Amino acid sequence: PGIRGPSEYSQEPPRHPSLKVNAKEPFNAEPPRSALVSSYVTPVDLFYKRNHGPIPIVDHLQSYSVTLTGLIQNPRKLFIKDIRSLPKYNVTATLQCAGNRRTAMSKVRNVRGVGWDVSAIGNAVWGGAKLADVLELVGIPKLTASTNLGARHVEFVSVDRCKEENGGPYKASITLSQATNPEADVLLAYEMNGETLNRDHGFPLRVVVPGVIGARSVKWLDSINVIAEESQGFFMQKDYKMFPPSVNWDNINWSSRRPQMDFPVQSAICSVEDVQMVKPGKVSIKGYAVSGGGRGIERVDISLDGGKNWVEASRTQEPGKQYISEHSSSDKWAWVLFEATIDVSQTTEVIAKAVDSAANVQPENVESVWNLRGVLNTSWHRVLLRLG
Amino acid sequence: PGIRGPSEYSQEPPRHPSLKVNAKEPFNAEPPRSALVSSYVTPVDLFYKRNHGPIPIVDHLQSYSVTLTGLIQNPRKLFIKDIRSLPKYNVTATLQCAGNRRTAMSKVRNVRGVGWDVSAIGNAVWGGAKLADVLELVGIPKLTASTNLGARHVEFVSVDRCKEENGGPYKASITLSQATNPEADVLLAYEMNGETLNRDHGFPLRVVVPGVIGARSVKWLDSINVIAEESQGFFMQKDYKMFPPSVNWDNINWSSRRPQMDFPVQSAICSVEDVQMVKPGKVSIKGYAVSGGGRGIERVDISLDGGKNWVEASRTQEPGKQYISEHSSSDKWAWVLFEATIDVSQTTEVIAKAVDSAANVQPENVESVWNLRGVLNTSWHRVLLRLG
Ligand code: MTQ
Ligand code: MTQ
Ligand SMILES: [Cs+]
Ligand SMILES: [Cs+]
Ligand SMILES: [Cs+]
Ligand SMILES: [Cs+]
């Protein structure tokens, strides 16, 4: 034991004051819209924070370890020294919380849960060890779907403490396939944006699962548990699922839906507020677009006339570099930043929507995708510009 | 030379007479709706047929070969005997033509091209050698993105002859990443539904690229050409791209869009016609749903009231087996068949839409996704039931 998960909030780390706080305990927060999109790589200070419990505190860093157990030949135990000695990779990858844009779905028909605007999302450079390498180390070769021992899934278990698990830890799981395929870039990350991982973001070690919803990138690892069936954790089985609009608290059956992993094409306008005063002339419409599953953004469309007509915005990743969608130069796990300059002379509704590399679209209206958990609001984002 | 590509249509193979023919020369055809969905595995007789030119004819089977050239150490030449001696795989995979459902898009605003109804799609068991294995044979190891010789793409060149290429061959390409990853199941297929591959479908050898539009699964292979940049073939650069609705023949710039590979969530009702007479009582609404990229179908929704309310249809792959979406038992490259029994007492509009494992949705209206080439019509399919 080099680390503990507190059961109360007295030793929480400090955060940037500019953060819009959606829940204090546990800590759930997001940057102001106008700062989200200022840079392609999200500074740690401004990277959104989503926690189900108190933040773990490390008393003694050497003596911290991740335990490799379950359907494995030799249940080893891996120290932070051991993880840093594996071949290091740097993966650029956006974490988007499945809760992103929930508040606007709630406004239409109420949802229980923490409120989020348009910034429950962040892009960072993750440094660490590939999970496939770590599993090779324990007798599970690369590109394996299942083993002779019955292994099919990999469960990541935290050291934190959540009310929902009655004081137990946050957990998630992924398939052995995904875990064991180095091209899927699942990372045991000990670094974020070139610095040592912070407390808020999972120090000393988190999993990062690219192209998958935020909720699966488990922070503050206690164990990596190789198992026969998917994790039966509360947050795999009784959350983070996409129900149809007909489903409510009286008819919900949690086993009727599969756990959400991949996520669909998303965009939002960030350079202006949902209802914003402007001076006549040129206004810069800037924002983000992403899709899960390693799919890029082929197109961002912007409309000034209630969606009769669209004009195409520009798209960019690393600044200077030209963005190309299904391409070896592109950062396939990361968002894409969009900009369009428009001419305003009158009170104007502006709308943004994105289309990904697989030609997937965003739903026109929240109503068609409205869901009980208030997740994956990918409605066309509509903003209103007014003449002040 | 054991095979040739004709320049004229005098030696075309026979087809099933039930086929609805959309163009005779070259041969472009699709089964009647009502037969499409009778079985999970589409019989070869009824599997849709899409050709840009005359069908190649083989005069001498031994002496046919595929040539491995380009950015490769030892330009080998591989005979059909050699391909069959590699480890055989059987992959279940749906080919959907990017042109599927084009005619309905054209009704709204005219598109140039061959007309298709709802059946430019088919599901089969493909037998052959993995392309990753074949490339390993020529010194390119598995899970490579690029090589020291500058290789980044793999181009498949046919032996056929197309007007568009001025008598030259149909070609496509994929990334070295996709080609070389055995989990992507790219196959050099010599078998289809347990029999030897037909002429129509590429005898003796075609590529099948799962989870990617039909157009990339190049038939009647002449050469597998490892190269530094994407193929400059006509059908990669000047076709099979997804343009926004504002693009027309006066403003089109082909380099403005990337070549379409993955495709989005699609469904159609097949057990009844777009306008159909029924007797009061119980009517079975049966169809297909698919998505590209190895994504499953999480949900199919059916509405009888103009899309105010939806009820969930059932979903099935292999009969008897229970379909589960992101699961080891599921056929991730294959379509999903849906059925719902409904009660009709009155004249009724029925609507079907699907939602994939990544929670991607279908666009409500063609207008929003209308495009010049008339590809990837994934509009909600609406049918009209009348009281006769
Ligand atoms: N140990 C641990 N405890 C958590 O509550 C926990 N929650 C997260 C969810 S649920 Mo969601 O609501 O799909 S977004 C999200 C991210 C947030 O990463 P970060 O704080 O570092 O921005 O951490 C995931 N990882 C976790 N790990
Ligand atoms: N050699 C060759 N010539 C073709 O014209 C050719 N066209 C195809 C397209 S273009 Mo599309 O417009 O996206 S659907 C489709 C499929 C059809 O395979 P099959 O006919 O056996 O169903 O083969 C692709 N492979 C090809 N291979
Ligand atoms: Cs431990
Ligand atoms: Cs890159
Ligand atoms: Cs050849
Ligand atoms: Cs399977």
Swiss-Prot record, chains A, B:
Region of interest called Moco domain, as start-end residue ranges on this chain: 9-241
Gene Ontology molecular function, alphabetical: molybdenum ion binding; sulfite oxidase activity
Sequence segments annotated as region (Disordered): 1-26
Protein name: Sulfite oxidase
GO terms (BP aspect): chlorophyll metabolic process; response to sulfur dioxide; sulfur compound metabolic process
Cofactor list: Mo-molybdopterin
Annotated spans, Homodimerization: 242-388
UniProt pathway annotation: Energy metabolism; sulfur metabolism
Function: Probably involved in sulfite oxidative detoxification.
Subcellular compartments: Peroxisome
Residue positions binding Mo-molybdopterin: 48-52, 97, 158-160, 201, 206, 217-219
Documented EC number(s): 1.8.3.1
Top enzyme class: oxidoreductase
Main subcellular location: other
Catalysis: reaction(s): sulfite + O2 + H2O = sulfate + H2O2
UniProt-listed CDD domains: eukary_SO_Moco
Source taxon at top rank: Eukaryota
Manner of cofactor binding, per the entry note: Binds 1 Mo-molybdopterin (Mo-MPT) cofactor per subunit.
Species assigned in the record: Arabidopsis thaliana (Mouse-ear cress)
Keywords from the named record: Metal-binding, Molybdenum, Oxidoreductase, Peroxisome
Any one of the GO CC terms: cytosol
Quaternary structure (record): Predominantly monomer; also homodimer.
